[PDB]
Design a protein around this ligand. Structure first.
Ligand SMILES: [Cu+2]
Ligand SMILES: [Cu+2]
Length: 440
């Protein structure tokens, strides 16, 4: 009813339970004015949005109908690595049921995708991704209850012969970006706002593309990061989202009109082919060209709601017991990527920590590309990057590091078990940039 806007179908918990059988299958679909066969969850691209509340039980049976093995990563969920098992392999024609309980204080936008080492980048690029939304009591305050809410899944694509384009040697080095820059699987959709205040949940599910988001004539009011709410709204003129990151923002439409949401130029350090070249620029790729993500039409006579005065206080964390240093490095021509000089070995435990303690992790990017660092299972607080303070307090699970930047993270260790940390330019994860944490 009303104007339509492309957005994944939502599956909601009922009576405290979200039970769903989700098949991973090659699927012919309509895409940007053409037909292409993608790999999808639940027959759609993006996959369905799972919407739950804290304390819900999720029982998701993943039916592997792919020609290769796969698994799921429950990205951002602070659950057991025995459930969110990065080492599990589901063979073709087999199923696996993931069962877990939504933590009581959790809120925000999360997502699910494959995590079978060696095949993450082709599988995610082919379309296997979906969102998970955890509702909050805070969603009931009038300043959020009356906002018009939408999910925006930012994910690019490239097609060749009616199927996802193959990975090239350059893609393994830079990570693969596509020429079709899509929102919720649609090319430059139009959102005709019925309310003057919007609450946009934002998900970068791309392999490697960065989204330097800006809305014409409007600031954004950041109310949530990857893994939960900020303590109060933070006004920004623009918002960079690296692969794997999420945010939620309020938009306050002041005037009537049509406003572009853009991904402004951003140079993440990707490298071009050659050396033999023109005069000054042809080695690095340089900044991305600007892209139009969607058109936003304000309602008539728009009168936005007041911003909420507070959101969620951020828990004070105990003093840390351990300091760790994780150094990221690259060998670009070999397209090999390292942490503390090693490539991932699933039979090698790299860090051993104690459950119910807090550590500080210093993650240092000694490469020339941006690398977005992700830690499974244990959300963290970013204290500083480059020795300067982070701009807000909120749970994160991906932190972007530009060349030479060192991030200092407070990592509370929660669930026992063996889990992983890795770059979320998933090509780099496939090519080495992953290590193993064991919590006891
Ligand atoms: Cu992820
Ligand atoms: Cu990387």
């Amino acid at each position: 009813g009303g104007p339509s806007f492309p957005e994944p179908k939502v599956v909601r918990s009922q009576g405290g339970l979200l039970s769903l059988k989700l098949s991973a299958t090659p699927t012919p679909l309509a895409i940007a004015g053409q037909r292409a066969t993608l790999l999808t969850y639940g027959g759609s691209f993006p996959g369905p949005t799972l919407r739950v509340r804290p304390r819900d039980t999720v029982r998701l049976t993943l039916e592997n109908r792919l020609p290769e093995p796969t698994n799921l990563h429950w990205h951002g969920l602070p659950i057991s690595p025995k459930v969110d098992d990065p080492f599990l392999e589901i063979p073709p024609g087999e199923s696996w049921t993931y069962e877990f309980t939504v933590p009581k204080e959790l809120a925000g936008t999360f997502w699910y995708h494959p995590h079978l080492h060696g095949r993450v980048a082709p599988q995610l690029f082919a379309g296997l991704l979906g969102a998970l939304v955890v509702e909050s009591s805070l969603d009931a305050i009038p300043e959020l209850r009356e906002a018009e809410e939408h999910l925006l899944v930012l994910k690019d694509l490239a097609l060749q012969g009616g199927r996802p384009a193959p990975h090239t040697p350059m893609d393994w080095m830079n990570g693969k970006e596509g020429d079709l820059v899509l929102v919720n699987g649609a090319l430059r959709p139009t959102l005709v706002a019925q309310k003057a205040t919007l609450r946009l949940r934002l998900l970068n599910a791309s392999n490697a593309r960065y989204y330097r988001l800006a809305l014409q004539d409007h600031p954004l009011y950041l109310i949530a990061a990857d893994g939960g709410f900020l303590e109060e709204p933070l006004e920004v003129s623009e918002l960079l989202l690296a692969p794997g990151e999420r945010a939620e923002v309020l938009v306050r439409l002041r005037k009537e009109g049509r406003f572009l949401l853009q991904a402004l130029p951003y140079d993440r350090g990707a490298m071009g082919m050659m050396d033999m070249g023109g005069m000054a620029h042809a080695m690095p790729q340089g900044p991305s060209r600007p892209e139009t993500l969607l058109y936003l039409i304000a309602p008539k006579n728009p009168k936005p709601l007041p911003l909420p005065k507070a959101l969620s206080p951020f828990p004070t964390l105990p003093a840390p017991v351990v300091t760790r240093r994780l150094v990221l490095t690259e060998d670009m021509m070999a397209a090999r990527f390292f942490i503390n000089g090693q490539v991932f070995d699933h039979r090698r435990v790299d860090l051993k920590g104690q459950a119910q303690t807090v550590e500080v992790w210093e993650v240092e990017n000694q490469g020339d590309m941006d690398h977005p660092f992700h830690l499974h299972v244990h959300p963290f607080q970013v204290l500083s990057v480059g020795g300067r303070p982070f701009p807000y307090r909120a749970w994160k699970d991906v932190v972007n590091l530009k060349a030479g930047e060192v991030a200092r993270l407070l990592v509370p260790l929660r669930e026992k078990g063996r889990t992983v940390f890795h770059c979320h330019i998933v090509e780099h994860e496939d090519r080495g940039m992953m290590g193993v944490l064991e919590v006891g």
